[PDB]
């Protein structure tokens, strides 16, 4: 008879809300059974009672480590259903802040993974960079993480004067912080002993289990939605896709570090190529008019009133829109019945399938190995439970 | 376009093999990590001396709500209920009637700050800059009830913070 | 940075890098907290003529999906959902880490 253990929810490596029922023989893990729903808040049903604008902030709170990326996925779905196009400067701002968001997420993932493993120091070094990044969020929107900045039609406000220079100043120094983190972890023999050949997954199994993102690219699969199915202006920036060879924790960590470096590259290109112009679509039946126009012209006041009370009607139809979020493929299946409120909104989170693969990935490992594999899957339960 | 992260090979000459053996027996990379932590030890820390020092914030920062006035002292709010309609959390409750002088004014304006998500949609929707999210963020309480703001509380907040609120609006309104 | 020169040298040797070049803490280099007012241009639809909304109405150009092969109602070469994806090319910038 195996011993049965509750790993979480009140556990340091369980991320607060995950209860993992583990069957063990000694410390060998005979079976993993994740129990979730401890953070199920009924987001998908709540959205059915909101307008599209009212539903937008719910996406900030799904993957609360990558807010603007969720906003962008939802905005792209709604813009596809509306048959409208965001203005170019809005698309460049979207890509820039998406890469800043990827930096935030990869910092959180790598440092918390290292903290589970036992290396506590890099968390403190990198969370000051996260703090500086938070200021960029707050300066653009007034909120440190739940910005609600990216909306269908573009962005809510234009960048304040002086933001680009400060982003450039941060970006010209972040590479040295990456170098220090890699000096602490990459060649360390304890870190390699804790990560090499742990949670090895084959390419075929990764595809069949619904994996996406690094969980694919660590196993050698050459796939990135920004390259294969680009959105906004991602087909105008140069970057490389890091590819692993072993499908284990160490290769996935290396991939995430290199993705941070490539995000720095993309951010540099975005900073140098930002064009002038308007920042939301020039269509007042979708995007609200400027406040000066609202207080001067009758049509602007009417459209402000209607967009903020009823909201825009979306033509009937259904779309599955996916992006390369920092944690993998993040998707929305959005069904519009023609009214101003969405009929159905199914949210596809990469962590759902990734955590469903945890029992397969943990076969033949110990307790500490399972801690490492949980860290390597990059799970946030806001998106898992929704 | 892609790159490999873990596809390198070690040279098998006696120099490289002996260097690897010396690293194995004398723990050179562990000493490198120790040197990195020692270097960080002599750097100046990033800690600020709160509450004597504060974190930087933008004029766009969303804080505690307030209800504003015209320079004559008249309330800006005219009970259009656009903030109530747009509020994603249904945190706003408004009741209105004609005033004694016939003006369109609220009799009830409640914000449940434990329902509020501080998104700032109410202040975007307001046509007369009546409801705002101010700069204050230090308003923790000892009871739940104190966070259910009525109209008197919000008017007091506006009267108390208007000097800062007006300056922040003057700084940001050309972007809105 | 107010660190003395010997401590600076010790930090550089321990880290193996020139730490003063890229300091994490930020000083005077960052942008001023007071900025001049912006002007914020307007979009392509801000015109006084040749600007009828029915010529720029994206929502009204959406239509129900095309029906192929309802059930109620040769050569025939085989097809794929799209042309096969072209194989990725190795990076010129840095092929190997």
């Amino acid at each position: 008879s195996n011993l049965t253990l509750n790993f979480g929810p009140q556990h340091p490596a369980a991320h607060g809300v995950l209860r993992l029922v583990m069957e063990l023989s000694g410390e060998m893990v005979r079976k993993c059974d994740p129990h979730i729903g401890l953070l199920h808040r009924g987001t998908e049903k709540l959205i059915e009672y909101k307008t599209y604008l009212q539903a937008l902030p719910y996406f900030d709170r799904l993957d609360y480590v990558s807010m603007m990326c969720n906003e962008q996925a939802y905005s792209l779905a709604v813009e596809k259903l509306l048959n409208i196009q965001p203005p170019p400067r809005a698309q460049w701002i979207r890509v820039l802040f998406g890469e800043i968001t990827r930096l935030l997420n990869h910092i959180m993932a790598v440092t918390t993974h290292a903290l589970d493993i036992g290396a506590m120091t890099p968390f403190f070094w990198m969370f000051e960079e996260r703090e500086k990044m938070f200021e960029f969020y707050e300066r653009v929107s007034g909120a440190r993480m739940h910005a609600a900045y990216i909306r269908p039609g573009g962005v809510h406000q234009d960048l304040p004067l002086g933001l680009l220079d400060d982003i450039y100043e941060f970006s010209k120094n972040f590479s040295f912080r990456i170098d220090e983190l890699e000096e602490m972890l990459t060649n360390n023999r304890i870190w390699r002993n804790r990560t090499v050949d742990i949670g090895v997954v084959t390419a075929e199994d990764a595809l069949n289990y619904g994996f996406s993102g690094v969980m694919l690219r660590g196993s050698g699969i050459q796939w990135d939605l920004r390259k294969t199915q680009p959105y906004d202006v991602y087909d105008q920036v140069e970057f490389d896709v890091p590819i692993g060879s072993r499908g284990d924790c160490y290769d996935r960590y290396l991939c995430r570090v290199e993705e941070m470096r490539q995000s720095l590259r993309i951010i540099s290109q975005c900073l140098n190529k930002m064009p002038p112009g308007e920042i939301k679509v020039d269509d007042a039946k979708v995007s609200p008019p400027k406040r000066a126009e609202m207080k001067t012209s009758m049509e602007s006041l009417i459209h402000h009133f209607k967009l903020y009370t009823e909201g825009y009607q979306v033509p009937p139809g259904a779309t599955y829109t996916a992006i390369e979020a920092p944690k993998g493929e993040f998707g929305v299946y959005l069904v519009s019945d023609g009214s101003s409120r969405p009929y159905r909104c199914k949210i596809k989170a990469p962590g759902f399938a990734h955590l469903a693969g945890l029992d397969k990935m943990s076969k033949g490992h110990m307790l500490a190995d399972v801690v490492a594999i949980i860290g390597t899957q990059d799970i946030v339960f806001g998106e898992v439970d929704r | 376009t892609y790159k490999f992260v873990n596809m390198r090979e070690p040279s098998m000459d006696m120099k490289s093999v002996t260097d690897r053996a010396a690293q194995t027996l004398l723990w050179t990379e562990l000493v490198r990590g120790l040197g990195m932590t020692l270097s960080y030890l002599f750097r100046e820390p990033a800690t600020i001396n709160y509450p004597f020092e504060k974190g930087p914030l933008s004029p766009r920062f969303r804080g505690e709500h307030a209800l504003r006035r015209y320079p004559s002292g008249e309330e800006r709010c005219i009970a259009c209920k656009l903030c109530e309609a747009v509020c994603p959390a249904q945190a706003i409750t408004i009741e209105a009637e004609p005033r004694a002088d016939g003006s369109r004014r609220t009799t009830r304006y409640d914000i449940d700050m434990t329902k509020c998500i501080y998104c700032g949609f109410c202040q975007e929707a307001c046509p007369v800059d009546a409801i705002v999210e101010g700069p204050n963020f230090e308003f923790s309480t000892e009871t739940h009830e104190e966070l259910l703001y009525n109209k008197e509380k919000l008017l007091n907040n506006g009267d108390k913070w208007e000097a800062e609120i007006a300056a922040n609006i003057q700084a940001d309104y050309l972007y809105r | 940075a107010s660190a003395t020169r010997v401590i600076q040298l010790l930090r550089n040797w321990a880290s193996g890098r020139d730490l003063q070049a890229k300091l994490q803490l930020r000083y005077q280099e960052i942008s001023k907290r007071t900025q001049p007012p912006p002007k914020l241009p307007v979009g392509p639809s801000h015109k006084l003529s040749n600007n009828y909304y029915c010529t720029r109405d994206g929502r009204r150009e959406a239509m129900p999906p095309s029906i192929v092969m309802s059930s109620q109602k040769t050569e025939k070469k085989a097809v794929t959902p799209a042309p096969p994806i072209k194989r990725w090319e190795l990076s010129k910038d840095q092929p190997y880490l």
Partner: peptide
């Protein structure tokens, strides 16, 4: 009647930004 004023990159673009790995050898034989 002033010029359009927006947050934009300085003429000639921004200075080059480093991203590649930098782990010096830094050791004896």
């Amino acid at each position: 009647a002033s010029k359009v004023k927006q947050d934009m990159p300085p003429p000639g673009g921004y200075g080059p930004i480093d991203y590649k790995r930098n782990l010096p050898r830094r050791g004896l034989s």
